[PDB]
Amino acid sequence: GLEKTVKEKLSFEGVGIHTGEYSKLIIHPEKEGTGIRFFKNGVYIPARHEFVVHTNHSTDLGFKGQRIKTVEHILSVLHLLEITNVTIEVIGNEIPILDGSGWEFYEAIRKNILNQNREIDYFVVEEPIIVEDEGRLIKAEPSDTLEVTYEGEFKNFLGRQKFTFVEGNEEEIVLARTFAFDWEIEHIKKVGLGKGGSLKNTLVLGKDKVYNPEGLRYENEPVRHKVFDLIGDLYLLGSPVKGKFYSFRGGHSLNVKLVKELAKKQ
């Protein structure tokens, strides 16, 4: 595939799920070889693993005193559409959560793609690798196409379920929303996070119920979202990725761990 950017600048605004503050981003086109980078208060923050500063409840990046929380959804959409050269100006300290999925990002960007004059140099997983953390595990192996499987084991009605993404099925995960278990909301609030969360941007699940009146978009929306999250974190490798991944109860922390190990080996 050819490197790509946007035909014209695109903007999105709303509240940050964690800061609860107003935030906006403006995606500006860039020439070939530029890569993906954020811009905040005068500083450019490359969308790469070296700049990750936090991974609990979101993937946050930072450089020279400037931080941007929750980049996983916008990066996932960019990765899925193979947008390789753009500057994402950010107003605020976090990417707007919108409806909790990548839908708005996806539909807007997909309609404004601009192919460029340069072949994409994909990050190709060369050899099998596995990272673990108290039961949680992620395995990556060679593959000509990006394939991502997530298997969860939930302590509620969801039980054990899995979902596999394969190239071409982007629409099957870009609508999956951010979720959250009622028994964990106090903690999230207590650690200074989740200030902008609401039934409008997050699926709240109980031991045996779904609080949102709209219910789940798919019986397995949570695992679909996890796949969506992992795909965004994988883009932190600096280039579109080709490989087969299997995540069992993985989260941002483990996702970034895998990314750093892959980058290290290669």
Ligand X SMILES: CCCCCCCCCCCCCCCC(=O)O
List binders of ligand MYR among 183-202 (CB under 6 A).
Answer: 198-200
- Name the residue with tokens 């980049």: 71
Contact between 38 and 136 under an 8 Å Cβ cutoff? The reply is no
Catalytic-residue membership of 18: no
Q: Smaller CB distance to Zn ion: residue 190 or 264?
A: 190
17 binds, among ligand X, ligand MYR, Cl ion, none (CB under 5 to 8 A by kind): ligand X
Residue closest to Cl ion, measured at CB: 56
Q: Which amino acid is at 89?
A: E
Cβ atoms of 85 and 36 within 8 Å: the answer is yes
Q: Which residues pair with 203 in a beta bridge?
A: 179
Q: Find the binder of Zn ion among 60, 94, 229, 233 (CB under 5 A).
A: 229
What are the helix (H) ranges across 62-149?
72-80, 103-110
* 53 near ligand MYR (CB under 6 A): no
Nearer to ligand MYR, 197 or 250 (CB): 197
Give the SS3 label for residue 126.
Answer: coil
Between 131 and 193, whose beta carbon lies closer to Cl ion? 193
**Residue nearer to ligand X on the CB measure, 58 or 85:** 58
Q: Which helix (H) or strand (E) holds 257?
A: helix 252-265
Binding-site member from 2, 53, 191, 199 for Cl ion (CB under 5 A): 191
Residue with tokens 């600096």: 238
202 CB-contact burial (10 Å; exposed 0-12 / middle 13-18 / buried 19+): buried
Chain residue at closest Cβ approach to Zn ion: 229
Given ligand MYR, Zn ion, ligand X, none, residue 210, with its beta carbon under 5 to 8 Å by kind, binds none
The residues that are catalytic are 252
Name the binding residues for Zn(2+).
73, 225, 229
